[PDB]
Amino acid sequence: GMKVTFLGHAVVLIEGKKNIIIDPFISGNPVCPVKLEGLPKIDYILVTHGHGDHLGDAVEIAKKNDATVISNYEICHYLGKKGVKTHAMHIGGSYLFDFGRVKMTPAVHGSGILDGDSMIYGGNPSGFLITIEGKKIYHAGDTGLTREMELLAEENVDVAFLPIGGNFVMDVEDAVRAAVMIKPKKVVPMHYGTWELIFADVELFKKKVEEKGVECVILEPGESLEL
């Protein structure tokens, strides 16, 4: 019986036997209700791609917790040079960790790491399919609509986190199409409202996806559900 908390933008914290955080953009995240000090003990950090609003505080959280960062090969190379413990994977690959299974899923996006004024290659972007005690969480990362999402329908995902903010990621209309492709038991919208460029009508998303038969739960930053 784990606690899954949305912390704003794309930050998702999973508290169970082990504690896992995805795309830990805490410092400088204007809708994040906690500071780094407010986080619990962290065991794993999952990073979907290199962009700073996802990579976030991964280095500091990992070092302060002796946590392992799970990401693609190229991002882990970058982090390794920062003195961070990593477990590299790549797109479509999966591994069984002490807490459960992680699979990196395809995304259509980019994965540059901005280090000073230099854009470093951070592999290709992903999402994560996480299986813990028979329960499945999908975090799509940053992505546009892609037919690769149809590969997830047979998984019978319990909770799918989908970006709806538009411009850099799917807007509301395409995220509805994604929800229909994936057919999760519940969908949670994310990556909206953080800046005005990614404003989204989240109430309209909930209304439209529920009309297609998929339950939607709107989590404000700091709110949680149990799996």
Nearest one of 111, 34, 160 to 24, comparing CA atoms:
34
Site string for a copy of itself, 163-202 (x = CB under 8 A): ---xxxxxx--x----------------------------
Number of residues located near a copy of itself, criterion CB under 8 A: 46
Contact flag: residue 145 with a copy of itself (CB under 8 A): yes
Q: Which residue has the tokens 């204007």?
A: 30
Q: How far is the CB of 55 from Mn ion (least distance, A)?
A: 10
Contact flag: residue 18 with a copy of itself (CB under 8 A): no
Region label for 71, one of left (φ > 0), alpha (ψ between -120 and 50) or beta (otherwise): beta
Contact flag: residue 85 with a copy of itself (CB under 8 A): no
Stretch that binds a copy of itself, among 17-25, 30-38, 85-93, 213-221 (CB under 8 A): 85-93
Which of 8, 14, 43, 53 touches Mn ion (CB under 5 A)? 53
Nearest one of 119, 149, 130 to 49, comparing CA atoms:
119
Residues in contact with Ni ion by CB under 5 A are 51, 142
Nearest one of 49, 47, 52 to 67, comparing CA atoms:
47
In a 13 Å sphere around the CA of 122, the CA atoms on its Cβ side amount to 26
Contact flag: residue 142 with a copy of itself (CB under 8 A): yes
Contact flag: residue 147 with a copy of itself (CB under 8 A): yes
Return the bridge partners of 94, or none: 103
Contact flag: residue 174 with Mn ion (CB under 5 A): no
Nearest one of 154, 98, 95, 99 to 128, comparing CA atoms:
95
Integer Cα distance of 111 and 49 in angstroms = 5
Positions 178 through 197 that interact with Mn ion (CB under 5 A)? none
Integer Cα distance of 202 and 172 in angstroms = 8
Q: Which amino acid is at 30?
A: P
Looking at residue 30, the DSSP 8-state letter turns out to be T
Stretch that binds Mn ion, among 50-58, 59-67, 110-118, 194-202 (CB under 5 A): 50-58
**What is the b/e burial string over 183-208, where b = at least 16 CB atoms within 10 angstroms of the residue's CB?**
bbebbbbbbbbbeeebebebeebbeb
Positions 101 through 140 that interact with a copy of itself (CB under 8 A)? 104-106, 108-110, 112, 114, 117, 119-121, 123-125
Which of 3, 64, 77, 135 touches a copy of itself (CB under 8 A)? 77
Which of 43, 74, 142, 158 touches Mn ion (CB under 5 A)? 142
Which of 28, 93, 199, 212 touches a copy of itself (CB under 8 A)? 93
Residues binding Mn ion (CB under 5 A): 53, 142
